Write a protein that binds this ligand. Sequence first.
Ligand SMILES: CC(C)C[C@H](NC(=O)CNP(=O)(O)CNC(=O)OCc1ccccc1)C(=O)O
Ligand SMILES: [Ca+2]
Ligand SMILES: [Ca+2]
Ligand SMILES: [Ca+2]
Ligand SMILES: [Ca+2]
Ligand SMILES: [Zn+2]
Length: 316
Amino acid sequence: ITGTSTVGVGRGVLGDQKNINTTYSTYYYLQDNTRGNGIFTYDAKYRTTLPGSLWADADNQFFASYDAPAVDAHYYAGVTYDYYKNVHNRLSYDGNNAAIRSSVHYSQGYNNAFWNGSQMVYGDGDGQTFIPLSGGIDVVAHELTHAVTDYTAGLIYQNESGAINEAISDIFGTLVEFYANKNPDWEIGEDVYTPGISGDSLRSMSDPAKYGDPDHYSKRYTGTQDNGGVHINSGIINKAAYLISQGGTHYGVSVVGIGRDKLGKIFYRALTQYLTPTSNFSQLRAAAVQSATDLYGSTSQEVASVKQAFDAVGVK
Ligand SMILES: CC(C)C[C@H](NC(=O)CNP(=O)(O)CNC(=O)OCc1ccccc1)C(=O)O
Ligand SMILES: [Ca+2]
Ligand SMILES: [Ca+2]
Ligand SMILES: [Ca+2]
Ligand SMILES: [Ca+2]
Ligand SMILES: [Zn+2]
C-alpha cells in the first residue's frame, strides 16, 4: 500500500517485545519499506486461500495473542533479509530486492510452514506438536532460504537434490540464528517444537541421529516417503556442514573446523555458482571443494576441512 513508513511495537510468539517496521495509511500495516521493495505480512485468517489480507492494525501496537505470529514472521523476515544483504551482498531472495511476502494463521492446527513458489506460509501448530512456527528464527530463515535456492541452484525437491535443498535451508536458517545471536544453536525449530517438552528439536545438525536422521551416507533413506527422504537425508549434509564449521571426529575421521563465517561463504558460493537442479551429494562435495578453492586456495586448510567433512559422512 502507499503510505508513510512507521515503527510499531509488539510481542512475538515467545512473549518478547520487539519493534516492527510498519506503514501508515488509515491503518498501520505490516509493511516494512526499509528493506528492498518491502516485506509484507498477511493474515490468512485460519483459511487456506493465499495470501489473505495485508495485516492491518488500528494503533500500531501488536500485543494481542492473535498478533504474535505476524510480529515474528515480519520481524524475522527482516533479520533474514539483513543477513543475506550484509553477509553475502544478496538483495532479497532473487538478488534484485523482490518483495518478501508471508502469511500467518494458515489453516487450523497446521503443523508446518512452507514456501509455496511465491511467498512464505506459516501454520499456528496444534498447540502440542508446535506453537506458531514463525516464532522460530531458524524456521523463518529456512523458509526464505527455499526462495533463494529456487532462484539460484533450483534443486529439485526430491531424492538427493531435495535433501541438499533441505540442508541448505537448515544451514542458512542456523547461520541466521547465529547472526541474530539470541540463544543460537545447531538445532532446528527448538523454539516452536513441542511446548510440553524441554530440550528437543525438530532436527539436529550436530547429531542428526538424535532425532533419527542419518549422519552417514551408508545410512541414507532410499524409500519414497517425504519426497524420497528430503528432511531425512538432509542430516548427512547438515552433519558435514556442522563438521566444516565446528570440527570433530566422526566415524573415525577428524575434521578441523573453520568457523561459521567460512562455512557460510563456501556454501553460499556453491549454491549460487556451482549447484544445479539435479545435483547429487557427490556433486555437492565437488561444488563445495571448488568453492573453497576459489575463496581460499587449493592448498588451504579450508579446502582440506571440506574434504575431511565429506569423507566423515561417507560422500565421495
Ligand atoms: C513437521 C514438519 C514441520 C517437518 C518438515 N518441515 C520442515 O522442516 C519445514 N518446512 P518446509 O521444509 O519448508 C516444507 N515444505 C514442503 O513440504 O514443500 C512442499 C511444497 C512444494 C511446492 C509448493 C508448496 C509446498 C516437513 O515438511 O516434513
Ligand atoms: Ca493493535
Ligand atoms: Ca536457538
Ligand atoms: Ca536453532
Ligand atoms: Ca520442545
Ligand atoms: Zn524445508
